[PDB]
Design a protein around this motif. Sequence first.
Motif, PDB file in Angstrom:
ATOM      1  N   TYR A 246     -19.468  -0.959  21.520  1.00  0.00           N
ATOM      2  CA  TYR A 246     -19.544   0.248  20.014  1.00  0.00           C
ATOM      3  C   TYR A 246     -20.469  -0.386  18.943  1.00  0.00           C
ATOM      4  CZ  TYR A 246     -18.175   3.085  16.273  1.00  0.00           C
ATOM      5  OH  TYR A 246     -18.299   3.865  15.253  1.00  0.00           O
TER       6      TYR A 246
ATOM      7  N   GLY B 139     -24.154  -0.953  20.290  1.00  0.00           N
ATOM      8  CA  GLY B 139     -24.820  -0.110  21.205  1.00  0.00           C
ATOM      9  C   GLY B 139     -24.552  -0.389  22.947  1.00  0.00           C
ATOM     10  N   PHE B 140     -24.710   0.370  23.781  1.00  0.00           N
ATOM     11  CA  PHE B 140     -24.476  -0.045  25.217  1.00  0.00           C
ATOM     12  C   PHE B 140     -25.606  -0.616  25.885  1.00  0.00           C
ATOM     13  CE2 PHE B 140     -25.192   1.483  29.466  1.00  0.00           C
ATOM     14  CZ  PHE B 140     -24.283   0.705  30.036  1.00  0.00           C
TER      15      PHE B 140
ATOM     16  N   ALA C 261     -28.110   7.655  27.968  1.00  0.00           N
ATOM     17  CA  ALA C 261     -27.288   7.053  26.991  1.00  0.00           C
ATOM     18  C   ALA C 261     -26.160   7.876  26.566  1.00  0.00           C
ATOM     19  CB  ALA C 261     -28.056   6.310  25.781  1.00  0.00           C
TER      20      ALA C 261
ATOM     21  N   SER D 213     -22.216   6.610  27.156  1.00  0.00           N
ATOM     22  CA  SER D 213     -21.525   6.259  25.888  1.00  0.00           C
ATOM     23  C   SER D 213     -20.488   7.152  25.652  1.00  0.00           C
ATOM     24  CB  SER D 213     -22.244   6.117  24.762  1.00  0.00           C
ATOM     25  OG  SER D 213     -22.364   7.433  24.052  1.00  0.00           O
TER      26      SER D 213
ATOM     27  N   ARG E 172     -16.626   3.643  27.208  1.00  0.00           N
ATOM     28  CA  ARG E 172     -15.640   2.803  26.251  1.00  0.00           C
ATOM     29  C   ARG E 172     -14.209   3.017  26.854  1.00  0.00           C
ATOM     30  NH1 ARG E 172     -18.953   3.910  21.984  1.00  0.00           N
ATOM     31  NH2 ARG E 172     -17.114   4.932  20.865  1.00  0.00           N
TER      32      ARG E 172
ATOM     33  N   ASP F 138     -29.312   3.466  19.870  1.00  0.00           N
ATOM     34  CA  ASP F 138     -29.006   3.931  21.452  1.00  0.00           C
ATOM     35  C   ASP F 138     -29.402   5.360  21.877  1.00  0.00           C
ATOM     36  OD1 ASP F 138     -27.780   3.288  23.802  1.00  0.00           O
ATOM     37  OD2 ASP F 138     -25.751   3.462  22.938  1.00  0.00           O
TER      38      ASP F 138
ATOM     39  N   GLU G  80     -22.015  11.815  20.237  1.00  0.00           N
ATOM     40  CA  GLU G  80     -22.036  10.491  20.324  1.00  0.00           C
ATOM     41  C   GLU G  80     -22.742   9.883  19.183  1.00  0.00           C
ATOM     42  OE1 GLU G  80     -23.468  12.480  22.165  1.00  0.00           O
ATOM     43  OE2 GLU G  80     -23.179  12.156  24.454  1.00  0.00           O
TER      44      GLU G  80
ATOM     45  N   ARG H  42     -20.725   7.328  17.131  1.00  0.00           N
ATOM     46  CA  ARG H  42     -21.074   6.103  17.019  1.00  0.00           C
ATOM     47  C   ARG H  42     -21.535   5.655  15.547  1.00  0.00           C
ATOM     48  NH1 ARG H  42     -24.799   2.775  19.555  1.00  0.00           N
ATOM     49  NH2 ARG H  42     -24.773   0.671  18.282  1.00  0.00           N
TER      50      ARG H  42
END
Lengths: 154, 154, 475, 284, 190, 173, 173, 173, 173
Positions: free
Chosen positions: B41, B44-45, B129, B133, B137, E72, E104, E108
Amino acid sequence: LYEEDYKLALEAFKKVFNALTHYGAKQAFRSRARDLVEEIYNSGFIPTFFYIISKAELNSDSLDSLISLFSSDNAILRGSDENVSYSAYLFIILYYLIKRGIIEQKFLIQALRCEKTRLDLIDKLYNLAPIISAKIRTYLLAIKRLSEALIEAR
Amino acid sequence: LYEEDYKLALEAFKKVFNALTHYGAKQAFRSRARDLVEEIYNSGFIPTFFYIISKAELNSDSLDSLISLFSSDNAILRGSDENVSYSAYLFIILYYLIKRGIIEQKFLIQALRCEKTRLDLIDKLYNLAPIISAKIRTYLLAIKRLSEALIEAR
Amino acid sequence: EELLMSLKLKALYPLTGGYNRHSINPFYEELVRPTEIKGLWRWWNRVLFNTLAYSTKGKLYTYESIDRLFEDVFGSENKKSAVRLEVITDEGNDNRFELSYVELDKVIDCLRNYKRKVSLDFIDNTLIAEIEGSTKIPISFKSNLDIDKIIKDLVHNNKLLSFELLGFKSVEIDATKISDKKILKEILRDLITNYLEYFNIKQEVTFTLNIYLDKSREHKQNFEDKLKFALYSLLVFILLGGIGRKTSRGFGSLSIIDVKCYDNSICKKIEDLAKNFLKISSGNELKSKIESILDCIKNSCIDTLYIENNILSEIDPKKNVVYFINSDLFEVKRINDKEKVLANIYKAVSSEGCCIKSIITDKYVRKSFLIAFGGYRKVEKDKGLDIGFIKNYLCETCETVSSFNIVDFLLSEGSFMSDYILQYEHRNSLLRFKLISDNSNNSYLIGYILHSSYFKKIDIKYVRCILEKLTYCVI
Amino acid sequence: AIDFLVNILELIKEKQCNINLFSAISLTSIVYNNFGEFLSNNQSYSTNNPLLKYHIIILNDKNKTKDVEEKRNIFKREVAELISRNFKLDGEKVRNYFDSLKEVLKSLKYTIVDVEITTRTRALIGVSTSLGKLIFGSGISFDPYMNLPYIPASEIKGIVRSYIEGKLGEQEAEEIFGNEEREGNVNFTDAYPTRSKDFLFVPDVITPHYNGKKSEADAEPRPVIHLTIAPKVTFRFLIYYKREDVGKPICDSMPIILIRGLGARSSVGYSLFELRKIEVIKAA
Amino acid sequence: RIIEIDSAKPYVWVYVTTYELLKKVKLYLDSISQLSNASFSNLKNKIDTILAKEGKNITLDSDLKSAILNEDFYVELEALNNKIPSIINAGVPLLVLEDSIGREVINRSLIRVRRIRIDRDKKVVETGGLWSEEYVPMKTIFFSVLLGKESKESAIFASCILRNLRYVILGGKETIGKGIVELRWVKDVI
Amino acid sequence: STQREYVFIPITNSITIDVKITIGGSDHITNIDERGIHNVLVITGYAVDEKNGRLVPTLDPCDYVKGILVAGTPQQAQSNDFLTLKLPANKLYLIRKKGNISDDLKIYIPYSSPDARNSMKTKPVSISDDTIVNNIIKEVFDKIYNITQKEKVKIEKVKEDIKELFSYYALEQ
Amino acid sequence: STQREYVFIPITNSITIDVKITIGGSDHITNIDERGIHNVLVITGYAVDEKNGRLVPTLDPCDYVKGILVAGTPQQAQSNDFLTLKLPANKLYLIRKKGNISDDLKIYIPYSSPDARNSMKTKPVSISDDTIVNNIIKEVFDKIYNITQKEKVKIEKVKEDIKELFSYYALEQ
Amino acid sequence: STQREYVFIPITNSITIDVKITIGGSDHITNIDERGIHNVLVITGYAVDEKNGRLVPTLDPCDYVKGILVAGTPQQAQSNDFLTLKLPANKLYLIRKKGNISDDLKIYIPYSSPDARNSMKTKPVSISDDTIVNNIIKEVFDKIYNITQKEKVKIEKVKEDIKELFSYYALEQ
Amino acid sequence: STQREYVFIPITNSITIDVKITIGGSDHITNIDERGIHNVLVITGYAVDEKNGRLVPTLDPCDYVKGILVAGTPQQAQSNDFLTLKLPANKLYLIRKKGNISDDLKIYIPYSSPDARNSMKTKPVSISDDTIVNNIIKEVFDKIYNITQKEKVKIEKVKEDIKELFSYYALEQ
C-alpha cells in the motif's frame, strides 16, 4: 418450538466457561463474543473465520486442549488472554459445526491433530460457508447473550 | 471456473506451504506476509513487486524451483530463509497475477530471466496497475491471515 | 534517568570508518562513532565473561547466551539497553570534505577512446594521476582539509595502511565506447574524493564518554552485579584494544585521560581502579597493573554469583569459536616514538617480516603460527604447501615442534575448522597490540594474545617466548 | 512511462526541492532493484543521468554478475548521497503553515505553546517507516504532502507522557493526558523542520558483526547504508489546550526529555535534540 | 503524489477528482435546488463544463501532459480550457480522472501511519500493541450541504451562526492534532 | 541407540512392575521443571485396556492416550506383546515441548491384543479424584523422577496438571 | 490573606521538626479525601539536603523535590535562611487539584545556601522500603492529618500512592 | 579553579558595570564563531527584577531567563547578593552547545531576594527594538569580546539571534 | 495469622455481650465509607434464636443470617458452643465487597445446639422499626465502630440501609 440453538449455545458456554480458568480470559472471551457475531453478519463467515484462526494461534499445544474440551470436562485452555479467547471462540464455532452435523467430528479431530489437514479443514469450511453462515446466526447470538450475562465486564 | 480471493489465497498458500521444507523458512515467510501488504500500500505494487523480486535473489536455480512449483506439487523452494521467504511471496503474487488472468504465465516466467523482458514487464505493469491494485491487497490480506494462523511465531 | 559515569579518553590515530569507510564525508565528520563504542564494549564484555568462566568454571559459553544473560544491561530485541552512551568530542566542528576544484580537463582526453586503470599517488604533496597506459599527469586540486605530510609519511611508511589504500586509489575506466567530459569529470572527482578522505588520520583525538543509566526502571534480582561486571569489562576494553579499523595493529588505541563517578554505590570501584592508570611509572609497573585488574576480575570482585543459573549455554567445539584471555601474555614495553612502532608492527605480523623472520625461522612454520594467530590469511593449493605442510603443524595429531594445533583440523579431512581457519575471510587476529600512553610523556606498548576455543593443545611458555621476542623487535 | 524511471535521477538532481521525494525514492527503487536490467539496456544514453556512470566504470573484469552486484552497491551509496545533497529544506512552507494554524487555534480559544527544537546529532525517526525502505531497508517518517520529514505528534505526546508519568505518577499522567475513560487535555501537532543549516538528510551506516551470532565463527559485517536527519535541523511543533492548569508540567517536561532521545537508537546517542525556544500564547 | 517531467512548474502534489464525485456534487445541487428556492448556477455551470468532457482524464488549469500519480498510476492527461475558473481557490492544479483509475488513485492517496505502544517496564513495543490508521491528507476538500426548514429559529441559525462558523474539530484523534478543518459556505465563496 | 519407553497413564494403577529402568540414561524426554510436565507424548487411535491396562489398537481417530517417555527398555521379558518401534524424533506428536530431540529414537508400546470377540466400545474418562492422583505421583512419578520432593515442594502444580493434562479413552469393558 | 509552610518528604529522618504550627487556620492546601493526597506542590530546580533538611537552590531543571503544604510560620527562629514569598495560588505546580484556591498564598520553604565548598552531586531518590513509609506516616502525616485512624481504613491506599508519587533529588553527601 | 560569572540579559541596562574580570585568562563558557552565540545558559523558575535587575526566586516551571556565562567576579564588594555555587558542568542547561566542558565549574548568579510583600505575577518579554540590541553589543558583547569588530564584522548576524534566541520573564512590578 | 468473628444482627439485642474484642488488630473486613457498610457477610442454611440469639444450624438453603464480620475472639469464654472455621477468603459470601481480603482467614461463628425437640420452623424477619435501628447503632455500631458520630453526619445513610441491607431468618421457637 425447539430453539435447539439456544440449548446448544448453553451446553457450549458450559464448557468454555469451565476452561478459561483465569478470569481475564473469561472477560476477553466476552469481548470476543460481543463483537464477532456482528463481524460475521457484516463481513461474512470466511473472512471472520480467517480472522479468528489468525488471532487464535492454533499451535499444537492449544489444539490438544481443544480436542480434549470436545470430550473431556477437566480440559483447560492454556495461553495468554486473547489467544485463549480466540481459541475458545474457535471451539464454539467448531462445536456448532460438529453437533449440527455440518462436519464429521472424526474428520475435524483428525484435522486438528495433524499440521497439514487443518488446511483441508479450512477448505471444506470454505465450500460450506453459505450454509454455515445461514445456520450459525442464532447460535452465535445466544452465545453473545450468555457471555454478556454471566461475565462481569472489565 | 472463478475462485474468490479467499479461495485463491488458500489454494496458493497450500502449495507454498508444502514447498518450504525447513521451518525457519516458514517463519520467515510468515514475517513477510505480515508486513509486505502494508508496504505494498505505502510504496505501490510495482516498486514493492520488484523489491520482492530482487530481495528474492533468484540466481536462475531457485528460479527453476519456483517455476516448477506451478507445474508440480513435489517442488521445493531452495535457498536461505531470508531468501526462500521472498521467493515464496513472489510466487504468491505470481499465482495471483496468473490465475486472475492479468498477465500470462509465459510472460512472467519469461521475465525474472532474460533481462530484455524485465523492462517491458515494467511497462506492462504500469499499464495494468489499476487492474491489479484494485484487489491484490484483499487477496494478500487472506495470505497474511493464513500465515499468522498456520505458522508458529518465531 | 541519571548520569552514571563519565570518561575522558584519547585515541592513537583513530581509523574510524563511515558509510564511505572513511572518517570524513562530504556531509559530516565522525571520528568516534558511539555505535562502535557500544559494539566493542559488548565484544569485550563477551570476551571477559568467557575468560572469567573458563577459569572459575572450566567451561565456555556462546555469544548469544552471554548477551542473553546481559540483556538487561546491554539491551536486546526484547529490552532497551539500560546504559546510554553519548560521545562528546572536543573540536566537534561542522567539518565536511569540501573539494573546491580539481581542474582535470586533460586526463579525460588522455583516457578517452581506450580503457585505463587510472591509479593515484601522493608523491611529495603532489597528487599525480598515474595512468597504467604510461602517463603520470600531476593533478592540481584544492580541498578543505590539509595533510601536514606527517600523515602522508605515516601512510607511506606503513606497509599496513599502504596496503588497504590499494582499494581507494584506482578505477578501471573503459571509455573506448561512449565517453564524455561531463561524466568522466564526475567519476574522477569522486575518485579524488574517495582517495583524499582516506588521509583524514588525525592523531591524539580526545573525547568524553558519558554513560547514563535508566536508574531502576525495575530492579531485577541480579541486575546491579551484571552492571558492575559490564563496567569492569568496559575498563578492560579501554585498556586493551581501541576504536576504529585495525585495532589489532595498534591504531585507534584508547588511553584514559580522566574518569568520574556520579553514583558512588556503583562505579567507585571502577573510578579508583581507573585513576590507577592516570600515571604509569614503567612497563613492568603497567604489566603489574594489568595482571592486577585481570586477577581482580578473577578473585578480587564478584567472581561467581549467577553463572550457576540456567540461561547460558555451553559452546560446541569443532563448530563454535570464542575468544578469552590468558592473563600471562601481556608483554609491555616502552616506545617513546609512536609512528615508528606503528610502522614496525608489520615487521612482526607478516609472513616475511624482519621481526618474525628471526624468531620462527622455518619458512614453513611462520605460516602456521600466523594463520593460527594472525587473523585470516589467503592460502590456495598451488604448490606443495598448506594442505601438505601447514596442515601438519595445525592438525592436532602432530609432533610437538609446533605446539599449537586446532581441534577439528584433520589430515586431509578437516571438517569445519579447516574452512574457518583457511577459507573464512573475516577472522580477527589473536595477536594484538596497543599503545596506551597518557598524562606522562612516556608511552608504552601492550602486546597480548587472546586465547581461542579452537586450541586443543597450547604451549603457553613457548608462545610467550615468541610474543616477548616480537614485542622486543618491533621497538 | 519507463522514461520517467530513466530520468528520475536527473529529476532529483534538478528540481531538488519540488519533486515529491516519496514518489521519487519509490520510483528510483525500481531502478535500484532492476539495476542490471536498467544497466544492460540502451537507455537512450543521456549525458546527464547518473546511471551512465556505471557503463565506463569496470569492477571485477572477468565475472559480470559480481561486477553488476558491486556496481549496485556503489549505486545505492550514490543514491543516498544524492538525496542528501540535492533535497534540502526550503522552510517557508512550514513557517506559513504554522502561522496559519496558530491563528486558527487562537480563534478557537486555545492556549498555545509554540516549540522549536534543534537536532543536536543526526537523528533517526521512524526507522521502520517506509521511505527508502525499498532501497536502504530503513525509512524516515516523511510526510509526502508537506514533502518534509516530520516527527509524529503521537511520538512526542508519548515521550512527554512517559516522562510526566515517571515523574508524577500514572494517576497524574492520566489526569493530564486522559485514560481510557476520559479524553486527554493536551493536544500536540506533528513536528516539521523550519530551518536547517546546510543539509536535511545525510547518509549513515550500521554494521552488525556479532548480532545474533553463536560465536566468532559465523560472525561477519553487514553494512546498512541508510539516511538520517542531519544535525542542526530545527523542527517545530505546537501544543495547545484549554485547561490552563496543564501548562505547568508541559513547561517543565519539555526541556528535559529532549536532552534524552526523541527517535530511534537513542541509546547510542543518535536522536538528541536541543530545546531552541518555547513560546506561549495564552488564551486570554 | 505526482511525478512529471516537462512542466513550467514542478508540483509536489495535486488535487485529484473523478467524474463520479462530480456527478454526486451535481446531484446534491440539483436535489437541493428542487427542494428549495436556492439555485447555484455558478457551481452547476462550472461542474457540467467539466462533466461534458468525461470519458478521459482532464487537467483543469495546468500544462501537465502526463504524470505518475501515487508512484503507481501513469495517466495521460489533456487540458480542459485553460479558461475555466478554479473551484479550489488555490493555484494547485486539479486533475479530474475517469473512474476505475481514479478509484485506486484516491483509495491509494490516503495516509496509513503505523503506531505502537511502548511497554513502560522494558521500554519496547508491547505485544499486540501495533496498529495502522488512515488519515486524509491536509487540504482535502469535502463538499456537503446543510438544509433547514422555516421556523424563525432557522432564520437566526443562518443569520449569525452560519456566518460565524469558520473552523471546527472533526473526527477523532484530536489530541494528535488531527481534527482541525474549515468550512467555506459556497454562498459567500461562489 | 538412545531408546525411550512409553507408558500408559490411566486411572488404573496397573503400572507397578512393568519396566526395568528408573533413569537408565541421564535424561528422559519427559521433563518436570517447576512448571509442570513437558514433552508429553500423545498416541492416537489407541485406547487403554484397564483390565491389565495396555495400549490397544483400535481404528478410531478419536482414541488418544497421552503418556510420558522414559529412556529405558521393558523388563527384559517382553517383545511378545510390546510394540517396539524406532522413529526419527519428528513423528512424535509431543505436547508442551521444551527442547529438541536428536532425530533418532527407539520406543516400546504396551500392547494388548485386539481380541475380535467383543466390540471395543470405548468411552472417554478424565483423571480426577486426587486419591488416585496423589499416589500416582509416588507410584510412578517419584519412583522414576525421585527429584520429586527434592526440588519441587510445590507438588500441587504437578498435581493439578495431571488432573487436567493427561487423559485417555476407556473401553469400560 | 493567609500563609503556608512547605515541607519536603524524603526517606530520611529529616521530617520531624522544621515546622511549628500544625493547623494554623481552617484549611491546609493539601488534603486527603477518600482518594489520596491532593494539591501536592512540586518544585523543580531544587534538591533536598537531608542532613539538616532544606531545599538547596540549584539550576538544573531536571532535579525536583515534592512535598505537602500546611498553614503557619516557621519555628520563630528563621526568615533569615528561608525562601519566603507569596504566590497567587495559580503559579504553583500543583498536582491533583481537588478544589480551587483563593489566589493569594504566601509560602515558607526550607532554604539552605548552596554551599559552594563541593560540587553538588545530586541523585534521584525514590521512596521504597515500606517501613520507612510507616515511620513517615506517623512522624508527620499523623502530626499533620489527624484523619489517620479517624476515618481511613484504606491506609494501604495512601501508603502506595505515596510510594509511587513522592520522589525527590538529594545531594547524598 | 574555574569560577564563572552569569549575567542576565534582559532588555534593561543593568549589565554595564557588574563584573571585574573582563578577560583575565583566555577561556569562556559562551563563545562566538561565525554562526551565533554558542553555549548560552538558561535557568528555570526565576525571573528578572529590572529595577537594578536581578533574578528573583519564584517556583513556576514556565519562568525562565536566558543569559551567558563568563569568567568573572562582581565588583569585589559583593557576594552578599549572589548565589555562589559549584556544579559538575552537567547541571547547566545550555543551548547552542559547542565545547566539551571541563566537568567542573563555579557560578555566581545575580540574585535578588524573594520580596515577600506582593505576589510576583510575571510576564515574558522578548528582545526587539534594535536600539536595545545596538547598545548592549557595546555594553557586554564588545566590552568583553573585543575580538568582535576585529574578527567578526557581521554584527547584524548576531543582531538576529539576540533578537530571537534570548528571552526571559519579567516581574513588571 | 488472623482471627475474625461474625456477629449476627437480628432485631434483638442479644448481641451486646457476645464478643470481648472491639478492634484486636486494626482491620475488620466490615468497613464503612460514607455510603454504608461494605463487605457484609451472609451464610446459608442458618437461622437464629433471638432469645439469647445464637445461630441454629438448619438445612434450608433459604435460611440466611445477615450480620457483620469483625476481627476478634468471642468473650474468651466459648468454643464449647461456638463454631470455629478456617476459610481461605474465596469461600465467604461477602456482599457489598469494596476492599479485598487477605487471601485467608479464621472465622468463628456463634453457634447453638440443633435442639431436636420441635419442628424448626424459622421465620422471615426483616429489620424494620428504625427506632430499634437507633439503639443498634449505639449498641454495636458505636462500641465497635466508634467512628459513628465523629465522621458520618449522614448516619441516616447507615440508618436507611440496615433497614434493608439486613434481613434474616429467626426460629421464634
